[PDB]
Amino acid sequence: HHQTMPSDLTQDEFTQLSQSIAEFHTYQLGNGRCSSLLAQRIHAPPETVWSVVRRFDRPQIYKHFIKSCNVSEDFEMRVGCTRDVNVISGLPANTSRERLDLLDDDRRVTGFSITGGEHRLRNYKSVTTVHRFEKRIWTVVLESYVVDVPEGNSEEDTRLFADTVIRLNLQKLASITEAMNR
């Protein structure tokens, strides 16, 4: 018997989601890369959670640390389209340019890449999936990513970093989506 964190999946969680992990949240590692997987349980229906997560043009809605995110005018939210996001002042990243890779309203799957900008997460690729859970009906959100490990940094350092941003983001996501409830 061991000890995991709360971002790591529980057993019941993993047995239901394993296939999803197999398909969407698994990356080719090795050679200065690193990846990670985070879960968040949310006492709200998947449909609500998905509608927020999918808003590629308005990540501010739940991601932290965004001063602004501009898309273009002839911007239609569809695969290949992009967003220029500006981070608040005082952080170790100023701007990010991200491309939408993946948008499936049927399977509630989405993902973007960073291509890139003023920061040190080179070639970051993320995927986020939402799932239904029953026993009283809740949601589980999985977010994973892979990204390059910068010159004089450890892979553990890089994972810690990305993990934190994602972890807080999902907490915000949880928070607003549970917010109205019923």
Nearer to Br ion, 52 or 66 (CB): 66
162 contacts 36 by C-beta, under 8 angstroms: yes
Considering only the stretches 35-43, 55-63, 67-75, 84-92, report the one whose residues sit in contact with Br ion under the rule CB under 5 A: 84-92
Nearer to ligand PYV, 119 or 172 (CB): 119
Regarding 93 and contact with Br ion (CB under 5 A), the answer is yes
49 contacts 130 by C-beta, under 8 angstroms: yes
**DSSP states along 28-60:** ---SSEEEEEEEEEESS-HHHHHHHHT-TT-GG
Q: Which of 44, 87, 127, 173 touches ligand PYV (CB under 6 A)?
A: 87
Q: Which of 64, 119, 159, 167 touches Br ion (CB under 5 A)?
A: 119
Regarding 159 and contact with Br ion (CB under 5 A), the answer is no
Regarding 100 and contact with ligand PYV (CB under 6 A), the answer is no
Integer Cα distance of 96 and 118 in angstroms: 6
